[PDB]
């Protein structure tokens, strides 16, 4: 930028006389060295390490941009379990200030049951839970909230049974067109926490598979602090 | 006088017993100047001959 | 005893003056300020602490 | 390429900022092909350079 | 320590121990820097003031 | 708008979290030379994908200010146009000089993005949430929309600055350094009794 003018190559410099060799490094950098490692070889090696890693960055960006995420929404389990761990984390924080926070369910775990026959997936958590008013406000009107709502990408209808410390257990059900909240017939079966029964779509039958759900848990939720149980 | 600089002139040195230190404070450390090393008056002759 | 010189006089200026061939005389005392010690340092004569 | 890069070696210089105690820049060509430096003289005050 | 022939003078500072008895030691190998490794006869003086 | 489109707003913002997370990741890299190389791949891959996405929407003939893109073929194109353009705004703001060199030169790229920007501005996607300003900011940055008096790209700094002709702070650095050098010299002389000139 500072100046312009790029030199050309002197295709026939060699003939010049009484001039010093301006290529010692290049030639010597490839001479076979018995009982020693050739200079050029070591250079190539590190180059492979650094250069290869750099290519990986392109790989990552390529996927993110060139993908369709929601079309290939296998992450929906990540979103669902991630919320379950988050809710267990939230209730754990509340428990320290208030003993009653964990009264409904002291144990913090996630239980997963797969019902292929009924096209239903049941995810049960013992997290903070949700009140009837919160079910209408938070869930009845959406909004990130993607963690719970990713389920609809593979599910036509979502059924949520939520019990919070401040309120009795209530069930919020929506098909994405309308939502209804009613008092839970079973009562405080959870004590506290949320169990989501997912009405999966026809395309989501593979997710119902016991192996598939376990693979998704390893793929995305392996690092969850709380133990994860899969029905077997 | 700095030993490294040749041009320094030791015009008048102190006595063999003389030294430079804080009178009130005891001499725990080695004196800055001791014996004849101490200089009372010194001169410099620059390369350009400035004095 | 003067800590600082008035106007444009500075240790650099005095050093330039000596390089020009001017003759300088310096008289010190127990109240020596920093500039006099610095000037000696440039000339290779090390004054003691105040 | 970032500043201070050397085009012919295709590498960036490790040491970018330094000063010449005993040499001074006399003339440099427009494209920097030839650089001339002048030898500094001894110290007037005799200080070690 | 005053070198008789050269006239050089070397001054050392003596310090008391816990018992208030002053102790001084001369080690030639270590003290080479102080004397510049200049061998010879030195008159020894005690200065108290 | 359409209820599913409202769901898309959550979907788009969700992608933004990954896009910003990567955007920080790219910042972690130090070498500019690598940085331009990947960034150029960002533009060529994104814009070429955008060109197909606009063609997909053009065949669909679905109004931007309209019902949620439903058919998967157009709907993914809608995800690409809005999501990629939003990331394009982040890339432009974070890296103004790099994009302008590799983007302004090509008329096709500017026209294609311009169709996308209006296409987003009619959908209303950049009207709510914390990413709504992004549409306004990017248009101003690219000159598609008038720049606000207070609109300044934080990243668009002149790293070249100006030759540090004024270096009194560095002059003080020189003094202190040489002063420490001078202090050691005196300390050396101390030691014990030396010889006498």
Coordinates of C-alpha atoms in Angstrom, one line a residue:
Chain A
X1 CA 0.0 0.0 0.0
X2 CA 2.8 2.4 1.0
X3 CA 4.4 2.1 -2.5
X4 CA 3.5 0.3 -5.7
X5 CA 5.8 -1.8 -7.9
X6 CA 6.3 -5.6 -7.6
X7 CA 9.5 -7.0 -9.1
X8 CA 9.5 -9.7 -11.7
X9 CA 11.6 -12.9 -11.6
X10 CA 15.0 -13.1 -13.3
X11 CA 14.5 -16.4 -15.1
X12 CA 18.2 -16.5 -15.9
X13 CA 20.1 -14.9 -13.0
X14 CA 22.6 -17.8 -12.8
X15 CA 24.9 -16.6 -15.6
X16 CA 25.9 -13.5 -13.6
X17 CA 29.5 -13.6 -12.6
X18 CA 31.4 -12.7 -9.4
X19 CA 28.2 -12.6 -7.4
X20 CA 27.4 -14.3 -4.2
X21 CA 25.0 -17.3 -3.9
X22 CA 21.6 -16.0 -2.9
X23 CA 20.1 -19.4 -2.3
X24 CA 22.1 -21.2 0.3
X25 CA 19.1 -21.6 2.6
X26 CA 16.8 -23.0 0.0
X27 CA 19.2 -25.7 -1.2
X28 CA 20.6 -26.7 2.2
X29 CA 17.0 -26.9 3.6
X30 CA 16.4 -30.1 1.7
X31 CA 19.7 -32.1 1.8
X32 CA 19.3 -35.7 2.8
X33 CA 20.8 -35.9 6.3
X34 CA 21.8 -39.4 7.5
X35 CA 21.5 -39.7 11.3
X36 CA 19.6 -36.4 11.6
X37 CA 16.2 -35.1 10.6
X38 CA 16.0 -33.1 7.4
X39 CA 15.3 -29.4 8.0
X40 CA 12.5 -29.3 5.3
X41 CA 10.8 -32.3 6.9
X42 CA 10.3 -30.8 10.3
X43 CA 8.9 -27.6 8.7
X44 CA 6.3 -29.6 6.7
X45 CA 5.2 -31.5 9.8
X46 CA 4.3 -28.4 11.9
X47 CA 2.7 -26.9 8.9
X48 CA 0.3 -29.8 8.7
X49 CA -0.7 -29.4 12.3
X50 CA -1.3 -25.7 12.1
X51 CA -2.8 -25.7 8.6
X52 CA -5.1 -28.6 9.3
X53 CA -6.6 -27.0 12.3
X54 CA -7.2 -23.8 10.4
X55 CA -9.2 -25.8 7.8
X56 CA -11.4 -27.0 10.6
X57 CA -12.5 -23.4 11.3
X58 CA -13.8 -23.2 7.7
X59 CA -15.5 -26.6 8.2
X60 CA -17.4 -25.3 11.3
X61 CA -18.5 -22.1 9.6
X62 CA -19.6 -24.0 6.5
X63 CA -22.0 -26.2 8.5
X64 CA -23.5 -23.3 10.5
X65 CA -24.3 -21.2 7.4
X66 CA -25.0 -24.0 4.9
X67 CA -27.3 -25.9 7.3
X68 CA -31.0 -25.6 8.0
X69 CA -30.9 -26.3 11.8
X70 CA -34.7 -26.5 12.2
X71 CA -35.0 -28.8 9.3
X72 CA -32.4 -31.1 10.9
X73 CA -33.6 -30.3 14.4
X74 CA -32.1 -33.3 16.2
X75 CA -31.0 -30.6 18.7
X76 CA -34.6 -30.6 20.1
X77 CA -33.5 -33.1 22.7
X78 CA -30.6 -30.9 23.6
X79 CA -33.0 -28.0 24.1
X80 CA -35.5 -30.1 26.2
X81 CA -32.9 -31.6 28.5
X82 CA -31.0 -28.4 28.8
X83 CA -34.1 -26.7 30.2
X84 CA -34.5 -29.6 32.6
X85 CA -31.0 -29.2 33.9
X86 CA -31.5 -25.4 34.1
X87 CA -34.7 -25.8 36.1
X88 CA -33.0 -28.2 38.5
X89 CA -30.2 -25.6 38.8
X90 CA -32.8 -22.9 39.5
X91 CA -34.6 -24.8 42.2
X92 CA -31.2 -25.8 43.8
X93 CA -30.4 -22.1 44.1
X94 CA -33.9 -21.3 45.5
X95 CA -33.4 -24.3 47.9
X96 CA -30.5 -22.6 49.7
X97 CA -32.5 -19.5 50.5
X98 CA -35.7 -21.3 51.2
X99 CA -36.0 -24.9 52.5
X100 CA -39.5 -25.3 51.0
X101 CA -38.1 -25.0 47.5
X102 CA -37.0 -28.6 47.4
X103 CA -39.9 -29.9 49.6
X104 CA -41.9 -31.3 46.7
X105 CA -39.0 -33.3 45.3
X106 CA -35.6 -33.1 47.0
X107 CA -34.0 -35.4 44.5
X108 CA -32.9 -33.6 41.3
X109 CA -33.0 -36.0 38.3
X110 CA -34.3 -36.3 34.8
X111 CA -36.4 -39.4 33.8
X112 CA -37.0 -40.1 30.1
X113 CA -39.7 -42.6 28.9
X114 CA -40.1 -43.4 25.3
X115 CA -43.6 -44.5 24.0
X116 CA -43.1 -45.4 20.3
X117 CA -46.6 -47.0 20.1
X118 CA -48.4 -43.8 21.1
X119 CA -46.0 -41.4 19.4
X120 CA -45.4 -39.9 22.8
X121 CA -42.1 -38.9 24.6
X122 CA -42.3 -38.2 28.3
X123 CA -39.5 -36.1 29.9
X124 CA -39.8 -35.7 33.7
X125 CA -37.8 -33.2 35.7
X126 CA -37.8 -32.1 39.3
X127 CA -36.9 -28.5 38.7
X128 CA -38.4 -25.3 39.8
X129 CA -41.7 -26.0 38.2
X130 CA -44.4 -23.7 37.0
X131 CA -47.7 -22.2 38.4
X132 CA -51.0 -22.0 36.7
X133 CA -50.5 -18.3 36.0
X134 CA -47.0 -18.9 34.7
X135 CA -48.3 -21.7 32.5
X136 CA -50.7 -19.4 30.8
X137 CA -48.3 -16.4 30.7
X138 CA -45.0 -18.1 29.9
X139 CA -46.3 -21.1 27.9
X140 CA -49.7 -19.9 26.7
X141 CA -48.1 -16.9 25.0
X142 CA -44.6 -17.8 23.7
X143 CA -41.7 -15.6 24.6
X144 CA -35.8 -17.1 24.5
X145 CA -38.0 -20.0 25.4
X146 CA -36.5 -22.1 22.5
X147 CA -35.3 -24.7 24.9
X148 CA -38.8 -26.0 25.6
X149 CA -40.3 -24.9 22.3
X150 CA -37.8 -26.7 20.1
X151 CA -39.9 -29.8 20.8
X152 CA -42.6 -28.5 18.4
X153 CA -40.1 -28.7 15.5
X154 CA -40.5 -32.5 15.7
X155 CA -43.8 -32.5 17.6
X156 CA -47.3 -31.5 16.5
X157 CA -48.6 -31.0 20.1
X158 CA -47.0 -30.5 23.5
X159 CA -48.5 -31.5 26.8
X160 CA -46.9 -30.0 30.0
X161 CA -47.7 -31.0 33.6
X162 CA -46.0 -28.5 35.9
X163 CA -46.1 -28.1 39.7
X164 CA -44.4 -25.1 41.3
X165 CA -43.9 -24.5 45.0
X166 CA -46.2 -21.5 45.1
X167 CA -49.1 -23.2 43.3
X168 CA -50.8 -26.6 42.8
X169 CA -50.0 -28.8 39.9
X170 CA -51.6 -27.7 36.6
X171 CA -51.5 -29.1 33.1
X172 CA -50.9 -26.8 30.1
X173 CA -51.7 -28.3 26.7
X174 CA -51.3 -26.7 23.3
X175 CA -51.2 -27.8 19.7
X176 CA -49.6 -24.5 18.6
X177 CA -53.1 -23.2 17.6
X178 CA -54.7 -22.9 21.1
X179 CA -53.7 -23.6 24.7
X180 CA -55.7 -24.7 27.6
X181 CA -54.7 -24.8 31.3
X182 CA -56.6 -26.9 33.8
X183 CA -55.9 -28.2 37.3
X184 CA -54.1 -31.5 37.2
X185 CA -56.5 -34.4 37.8
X186 CA -53.8 -36.4 39.5
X187 CA -52.8 -33.6 41.9
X188 CA -49.2 -32.9 42.9
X189 CA -47.9 -36.2 41.5
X190 CA -44.6 -34.6 40.8
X191 CA -44.6 -32.7 44.1
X192 CA -42.7 -30.1 42.1
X193 CA -41.2 -30.0 38.6
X194 CA -42.4 -30.5 35.1
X195 CA -43.2 -33.6 33.0
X196 CA -43.6 -33.0 29.3
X197 CA -45.5 -35.5 27.1
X198 CA -44.7 -34.9 23.5
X199 CA -47.1 -35.8 20.7
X200 CA -44.4 -36.4 18.0
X201 CA -45.0 -36.1 14.3
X202 CA -44.9 -39.0 11.9
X203 CA -41.4 -38.0 10.8
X204 CA -40.2 -38.1 14.4
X205 CA -40.7 -41.9 14.8
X206 CA -36.9 -42.4 14.8
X207 CA -36.6 -40.1 17.8
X208 CA -39.0 -42.5 19.7
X209 CA -36.4 -45.2 19.3
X210 CA -34.7 -46.1 22.6
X211 CA -31.3 -46.1 21.0
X212 CA -31.9 -42.8 19.2
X213 CA -32.9 -40.9 22.4
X214 CA -29.8 -42.3 24.2
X215 CA -27.6 -41.3 21.3
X216 CA -29.1 -37.8 21.5
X217 CA -28.4 -37.6 25.2
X218 CA -24.8 -38.6 24.7
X219 CA -24.5 -36.2 21.7
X220 CA -25.8 -33.1 23.4
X221 CA -26.7 -33.7 27.1
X222 CA -23.7 -35.8 28.2
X223 CA -22.3 -32.9 30.2
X224 CA -25.5 -32.4 32.2
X225 CA -24.6 -32.4 35.9
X226 CA -27.8 -34.2 37.0
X227 CA -28.1 -37.9 36.2
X228 CA -30.2 -38.7 33.2
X229 CA -32.4 -41.9 33.1
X230 CA -33.7 -43.5 29.9
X231 CA -36.6 -46.0 30.1
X232 CA -35.4 -49.5 29.5
Chain B
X1 CA 34.8 9.9 39.6
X2 CA 33.6 7.1 37.3
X3 CA 36.4 4.8 36.4
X4 CA 35.0 4.0 32.9
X5 CA 35.4 7.7 31.7
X6 CA 39.1 8.4 31.0
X7 CA 38.7 12.2 30.7
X8 CA 37.8 12.7 34.4
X9 CA 40.4 14.7 36.3
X10 CA 41.0 14.1 40.0
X11 CA 42.0 17.6 40.8
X12 CA 41.7 17.3 44.6
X13 CA 41.2 14.1 46.5
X14 CA 40.2 13.7 50.1
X15 CA 42.4 12.5 53.0
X16 CA 43.0 8.8 53.5
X17 CA 40.7 8.9 56.6
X18 CA 38.0 10.9 54.9
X19 CA 34.7 9.3 53.7
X20 CA 31.3 10.5 52.6
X21 CA 28.3 9.3 54.6
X22 CA 25.3 10.6 56.5
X23 CA 26.8 11.8 59.8
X24 CA 23.8 11.0 62.0
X25 CA 23.2 7.5 60.5
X26 CA 25.6 4.7 61.4
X27 CA 27.7 3.2 58.7
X28 CA 26.0 -0.1 58.1
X29 CA 26.7 0.0 54.3
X30 CA 29.9 0.6 52.5
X31 CA 30.6 4.3 52.1
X32 CA 29.8 5.9 48.7
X33 CA 33.3 7.4 48.8
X34 CA 36.1 6.1 51.1
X35 CA 39.7 7.2 51.6
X36 CA 41.4 9.0 48.7
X37 CA 38.6 7.9 46.3
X38 CA 36.5 10.8 47.6
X39 CA 36.9 13.8 45.4
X40 CA 36.4 17.4 46.5
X41 CA 37.1 19.1 43.2
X42 CA 37.3 17.4 39.8
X43 CA 37.6 18.6 36.2
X44 CA 36.7 17.4 32.7
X45 CA 38.4 17.9 29.4
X46 CA 35.9 17.2 26.6
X47 CA 36.9 15.9 23.2
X48 CA 35.9 19.2 21.7
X49 CA 38.1 20.8 24.5
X50 CA 35.3 22.2 26.6
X51 CA 36.3 22.4 30.3
Chain C
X1 CA 19.9 24.3 46.4
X2 CA 17.7 25.0 43.3
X3 CA 15.6 22.1 42.3
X4 CA 14.8 23.4 38.8
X5 CA 16.2 26.0 36.4
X6 CA 14.1 28.9 35.1
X7 CA 13.1 29.4 31.5
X8 CA 14.5 27.1 28.9
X9 CA 17.7 26.1 30.8
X10 CA 17.7 22.3 31.2
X11 CA 20.2 19.5 31.7
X12 CA 20.0 18.8 27.9
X13 CA 20.6 22.5 27.1
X14 CA 23.7 22.7 29.4
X15 CA 25.0 19.5 27.8
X16 CA 24.6 21.0 24.4
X17 CA 26.4 24.2 25.6
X18 CA 29.4 22.2 26.8
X19 CA 29.5 20.4 23.5
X20 CA 29.6 23.8 21.8
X21 CA 32.8 24.6 23.7
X22 CA 31.5 26.7 26.5
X23 CA 33.2 26.5 29.9
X24 CA 31.0 25.6 32.9
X25 CA 31.7 25.9 36.6
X26 CA 29.4 24.1 39.1
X27 CA 29.4 24.6 42.9
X28 CA 27.6 22.1 45.1
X29 CA 26.6 21.8 48.8
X30 CA 24.7 19.5 51.1
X31 CA 21.4 20.9 49.8
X32 CA 22.1 19.7 46.2
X33 CA 19.1 19.4 44.1
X34 CA 18.5 16.7 41.5
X35 CA 19.6 18.7 38.4
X36 CA 23.1 19.2 39.6
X37 CA 23.5 15.5 40.4
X38 CA 22.1 14.7 36.9
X39 CA 24.6 17.1 35.3
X40 CA 27.4 15.4 37.0
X41 CA 26.1 12.0 35.8
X42 CA 26.4 13.2 32.2
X43 CA 29.9 14.4 32.9
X44 CA 30.9 11.2 34.6
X45 CA 31.2 12.8 38.1
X46 CA 28.9 11.2 40.6
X47 CA 27.6 13.3 43.4
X48 CA 26.6 11.7 46.7
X49 CA 23.0 11.7 48.0
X50 CA 21.4 14.8 49.6
Chain D
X1 CA -0.7 -8.6 5.4
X2 CA 0.0 -7.0 8.7
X3 CA 2.5 -4.1 9.1
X4 CA 6.2 -4.9 9.3
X5 CA 5.9 -7.9 7.0
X6 CA 8.9 -8.9 4.8
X7 CA 7.6 -9.8 1.3
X8 CA 10.6 -11.7 0.0
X9 CA 10.9 -13.9 3.1
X10 CA 7.2 -14.1 3.4
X11 CA 7.5 -13.6 7.2
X12 CA 6.8 -10.9 9.7
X13 CA 9.8 -9.5 11.6
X14 CA 9.9 -10.5 15.2
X15 CA 11.7 -7.3 16.4
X16 CA 9.9 -4.3 15.2
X17 CA 11.0 -1.4 17.5
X18 CA 14.7 -0.7 18.2
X19 CA 17.1 2.2 18.1
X20 CA 20.6 2.6 16.6
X21 CA 23.1 3.8 19.2
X22 CA 26.2 4.0 17.0
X23 CA 24.6 4.5 13.5
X24 CA 22.3 7.2 12.1
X25 CA 20.2 7.1 8.9
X26 CA 21.8 9.2 6.2
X27 CA 19.8 8.4 3.0
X28 CA 17.3 5.8 1.9
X29 CA 16.1 5.1 -1.7
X30 CA 12.5 5.6 -2.7
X31 CA 11.8 1.8 -2.7
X32 CA 14.3 1.2 0.2
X33 CA 16.5 -1.0 -2.1
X34 CA 19.7 0.7 -0.9
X35 CA 20.1 2.1 2.7
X36 CA 23.0 4.2 3.8
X37 CA 24.0 4.8 7.4
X38 CA 26.6 7.1 8.8
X39 CA 29.1 6.1 11.5
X40 CA 28.6 8.1 14.6
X41 CA 31.7 9.6 16.2
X42 CA 32.9 9.1 19.8
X43 CA 31.1 10.7 22.7
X44 CA 32.1 14.3 23.4
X45 CA 31.7 13.7 27.2
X46 CA 33.4 10.3 27.1
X47 CA 30.3 8.4 28.2
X48 CA 30.1 4.8 27.2
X49 CA 27.8 4.6 24.1
Chain E
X1 CA 45.7 -2.2 53.7
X2 CA 48.3 -0.1 52.1
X3 CA 50.6 -1.6 49.5
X4 CA 54.1 -0.4 50.4
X5 CA 55.6 -0.3 46.9
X6 CA 52.6 0.9 44.8
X7 CA 51.1 3.1 47.5
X8 CA 47.7 1.7 46.9
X9 CA 45.1 1.9 49.8
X10 CA 42.3 -0.5 50.4
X11 CA 39.7 0.3 53.0
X12 CA 37.3 -2.2 54.6
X13 CA 34.5 -1.6 57.1
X14 CA 34.6 -3.7 60.3
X15 CA 31.3 -4.7 62.0
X16 CA 30.7 -6.0 65.5
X17 CA 29.1 -9.3 66.2
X18 CA 26.4 -10.1 68.8
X19 CA 29.1 -10.0 71.6
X20 CA 30.3 -6.5 70.4
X21 CA 33.7 -8.0 69.5
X22 CA 34.7 -6.9 66.0
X23 CA 35.7 -9.6 63.6
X24 CA 37.5 -9.2 60.2
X25 CA 38.5 -11.9 57.8
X26 CA 40.5 -11.8 54.6
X27 CA 40.0 -14.4 51.9
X28 CA 42.3 -13.9 49.0
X29 CA 40.3 -15.9 46.4
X30 CA 37.1 -14.0 47.1
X31 CA 38.7 -10.6 47.6
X32 CA 40.4 -10.6 44.3
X33 CA 37.9 -8.0 43.0
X34 CA 38.6 -5.6 45.8
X35 CA 42.4 -5.8 45.5
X36 CA 42.3 -6.5 41.7
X37 CA 44.4 -9.6 42.6
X38 CA 47.4 -7.3 43.2
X39 CA 49.8 -9.3 45.3
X40 CA 52.3 -7.7 47.6
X41 CA 53.1 -6.5 51.1
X42 CA 50.4 -4.3 52.7
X43 CA 50.7 -2.3 55.9
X44 CA 47.6 -2.9 58.1
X45 CA 45.9 0.0 59.9
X46 CA 43.0 0.4 62.3
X47 CA 41.0 3.6 61.9
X48 CA 38.7 4.4 64.8
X49 CA 36.9 7.7 65.0
Chain F
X1 CA -47.9 -11.9 11.9
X2 CA -48.5 -15.6 11.3
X3 CA -48.2 -17.6 14.6
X4 CA -45.6 -19.9 13.1
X5 CA -43.7 -16.8 11.9
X6 CA -43.8 -15.6 15.5
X7 CA -42.2 -18.9 16.4
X8 CA -39.6 -18.1 13.7
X9 CA -38.6 -14.9 15.5
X10 CA -37.5 -17.1 18.4
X11 CA -35.8 -19.4 15.9
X12 CA -33.9 -16.5 14.2
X13 CA -32.8 -15.1 17.5
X14 CA -31.7 -18.6 18.6
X15 CA -29.4 -18.7 15.5
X16 CA -28.1 -15.3 16.5
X17 CA -26.7 -16.7 19.7
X18 CA -24.6 -19.2 17.8
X19 CA -23.7 -16.6 15.1
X20 CA -22.5 -14.1 17.8
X21 CA -20.8 -17.0 19.6
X22 CA -18.8 -17.8 16.5
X23 CA -18.3 -14.1 15.8
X24 CA -16.5 -13.9 19.1
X25 CA -14.6 -17.0 18.2
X26 CA -13.3 -15.4 15.0
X27 CA -12.2 -12.4 17.1
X28 CA -10.0 -14.8 19.1
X29 CA -7.9 -15.4 16.1
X30 CA -4.9 -13.0 15.8
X31 CA -3.5 -13.2 12.3
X32 CA -5.2 -11.0 9.9
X33 CA -3.9 -13.1 7.0
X34 CA -5.8 -16.1 8.1
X35 CA -8.7 -13.8 9.0
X36 CA -9.3 -12.5 5.5
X37 CA -9.0 -16.0 4.0
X38 CA -11.8 -17.4 6.0
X39 CA -13.8 -14.2 5.8
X40 CA -13.6 -14.4 2.0
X41 CA -15.0 -17.9 2.3
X42 CA -17.7 -16.4 4.5
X43 CA -18.7 -13.9 1.8
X44 CA -18.5 -16.3 -1.2
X45 CA -20.4 -19.1 0.6
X46 CA -23.0 -16.8 2.2
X47 CA -23.7 -14.7 -0.9
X48 CA -23.8 -17.7 -3.3
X49 CA -26.2 -19.4 -0.9
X50 CA -28.1 -16.1 -0.7
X51 CA -28.4 -16.0 -4.5
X52 CA -30.0 -19.4 -4.4
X53 CA -32.2 -18.4 -1.5
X54 CA -33.5 -15.3 -3.3
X55 CA -34.2 -17.4 -6.4
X56 CA -36.1 -19.9 -4.2
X57 CA -38.2 -17.1 -2.7
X58 CA -38.7 -15.6 -6.2
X59 CA -40.1 -18.9 -7.4
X60 CA -42.3 -19.2 -4.3
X61 CA -43.6 -15.6 -4.9
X62 CA -44.4 -15.3 -1.1
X63 CA -44.8 -11.8 0.1
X64 CA -42.2 -10.8 2.7
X65 CA -45.0 -9.0 4.7
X66 CA -47.1 -12.1 4.7
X67 CA -47.9 -15.6 6.2
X68 CA -45.0 -17.5 7.6
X69 CA -43.0 -19.4 5.0
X70 CA -44.5 -22.8 5.2
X71 CA -43.2 -25.1 2.4
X72 CA -39.9 -26.4 3.6
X73 CA -38.2 -25.4 0.3
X74 CA -39.0 -21.7 0.6
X75 CA -39.0 -21.8 4.4
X76 CA -35.3 -22.8 4.6
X77 CA -34.6 -20.1 2.1
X78 CA -36.3 -17.6 4.4
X79 CA -34.1 -18.9 7.2
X80 CA -31.0 -18.4 5.0
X81 CA -31.9 -14.9 3.8
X82 CA -32.8 -13.4 7.2
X83 CA -30.3 -15.4 9.3
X84 CA -27.4 -15.1 6.9
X85 CA -28.0 -11.4 6.3
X86 CA -28.2 -10.7 10.0
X87 CA -24.8 -12.4 10.4
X88 CA -23.7 -10.4 7.4
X89 CA -24.5 -7.3 9.4
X90 CA -22.4 -8.5 12.3
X91 CA -19.5 -9.3 9.9
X92 CA -19.8 -5.9 8.2
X93 CA -19.9 -4.0 11.5
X94 CA -17.1 -6.0 13.1
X95 CA -15.0 -6.1 9.9
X96 CA -16.0 -3.1 7.9
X97 CA -12.9 -2.8 5.7
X98 CA -12.6 -6.5 5.0
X99 CA -16.2 -6.8 3.7
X100 CA -16.2 -3.6 1.7
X101 CA -13.1 -4.7 -0.2
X102 CA -14.6 -8.1 -1.0
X103 CA -18.3 -7.0 -1.3
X104 CA -18.7 -3.4 -2.6
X105 CA -16.7 -4.2 -5.8
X106 CA -19.4 -6.7 -7.0
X107 CA -22.6 -5.1 -8.2
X108 CA -24.4 -8.5 -8.0
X109 CA -23.6 -8.9 -4.4
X110 CA -24.9 -5.4 -3.4
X111 CA -28.1 -5.8 -5.4
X112 CA -28.7 -9.3 -4.0
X113 CA -28.2 -8.1 -0.4
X114 CA -30.3 -5.1 -1.1
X115 CA -33.2 -7.3 -2.1
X116 CA -32.7 -9.3 1.1
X117 CA -32.6 -6.1 3.3
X118 CA -35.9 -4.9 1.9
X119 CA -37.2 -8.4 2.1
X120 CA -36.4 -8.4 5.8
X121 CA -37.6 -4.9 6.3
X122 CA -41.0 -5.8 5.0
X123 CA -41.3 -9.0 6.9
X124 CA -40.9 -7.1 10.2
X125 CA -38.4 -9.6 11.6
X126 CA -36.0 -6.8 12.6
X127 CA -38.7 -4.9 14.5
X128 CA -38.7 -6.6 17.9
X129 CA -36.1 -8.1 20.1
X130 CA -32.5 -7.1 20.6
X131 CA -31.6 -7.8 17.0
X132 CA -34.1 -5.3 15.4
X133 CA -31.5 -2.5 15.4
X134 CA -29.2 -4.7 13.4
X135 CA -31.2 -4.1 10.2
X136 CA -31.0 -0.3 10.6
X137 CA -27.3 -0.3 11.6
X138 CA -26.2 -2.5 8.7
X139 CA -28.0 -0.5 6.1
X140 CA -26.5 2.7 7.5
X141 CA -23.0 1.1 7.5
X142 CA -23.4 -0.1 3.9
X143 CA -24.8 3.3 2.8
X144 CA -28.2 1.8 1.7
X145 CA -29.8 4.0 4.4
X146 CA -28.8 7.4 5.6
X147 CA -26.2 7.4 8.3
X148 CA -27.3 8.9 11.6
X149 CA -25.4 11.8 13.0
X150 CA -24.5 9.7 16.1
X151 CA -24.1 6.4 14.2
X152 CA -20.4 5.4 14.4
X153 CA -19.1 1.9 13.8
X154 CA -17.1 1.1 16.9
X155 CA -15.0 -1.4 15.0
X156 CA -14.3 1.0 12.1
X157 CA -11.3 2.6 13.8
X158 CA -8.2 3.8 11.9
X159 CA -5.7 1.4 13.2
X160 CA -3.1 3.2 11.1
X161 CA -3.8 6.3 13.3
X162 CA -1.0 8.9 12.9
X163 CA 2.7 8.6 13.1
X164 CA 3.5 9.0 16.9
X165 CA 5.5 12.2 16.2
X166 CA 4.3 13.3 19.7
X167 CA 5.9 10.8 22.0
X168 CA 6.6 12.6 25.3
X169 CA 5.3 9.5 27.2
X170 CA 7.9 7.4 25.3
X171 CA 10.5 10.0 26.0
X172 CA 9.8 9.5 29.7
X173 CA 10.1 5.7 29.1
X174 CA 13.5 6.2 27.5
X175 CA 14.6 8.4 30.5
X176 CA 13.5 5.9 33.1
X177 CA 15.1 3.0 31.3
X178 CA 18.4 4.8 30.9
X179 CA 18.1 6.0 34.5
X180 CA 17.8 2.4 35.8
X181 CA 20.9 1.7 33.7
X182 CA 22.6 4.7 35.4
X183 CA 21.6 3.5 38.8
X184 CA 23.1 0.0 38.3
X185 CA 26.4 1.7 37.3
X186 CA 26.6 3.5 40.6
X187 CA 25.7 0.4 42.6
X188 CA 28.5 -1.5 40.9
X189 CA 31.0 1.1 41.9
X190 CA 29.9 0.7 45.5
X191 CA 31.0 -2.8 46.4
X192 CA 34.0 -2.4 48.7
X193 CA 37.4 -0.7 48.4
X194 CA 38.6 -0.5 44.8
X195 CA 42.0 0.5 43.6
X196 CA 42.8 4.3 43.3
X197 CA 43.7 6.0 40.0

